[PDB]
Amino acid sequence: AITVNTNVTSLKAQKNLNTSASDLATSMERLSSGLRINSAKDDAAGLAISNRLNS
Amino acid sequence: ALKAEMDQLANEIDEIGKTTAFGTTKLLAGGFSAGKNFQVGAQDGEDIKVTVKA
């Protein structure tokens, strides 16, 4: 069909572009900080193990 | 005098024996006497055993 009111290819392209931008921002943060684990989003058990090793 | 220094050295050997740790788990006290396994592959059973006696 040739339709004007809905465009699905654009929706899917938007979602892919957003995923790529998120990944790039995460990498930029990790290079700026120098650490792999900046939150518990990253690795939760490693966070606690590293707190104990830090103590 | 000689024996007093021998006793202090034996005390420090015992202290190193009970104090060494990885974070909070003791290593030279007998907890690894029967080793622990680390899975070093992607499938079950592909693992290496680390054994340390007291």
Automatic annotation (TrEMBL), chain B:
<comment type="function">
    <text>Flagellin is the subunit protein which polymerizes to form the filaments of bacterial flagella. FlaB is not essential for flagellar synthesis and motility.</text>
</comment>
<comment type="similarity">
    <text>Belongs to the bacterial flagellin family.</text>
</comment>
<protein>
    <recommendedName>
        <fullName>Flagellin</fullName>
    </recommendedName>
</protein>
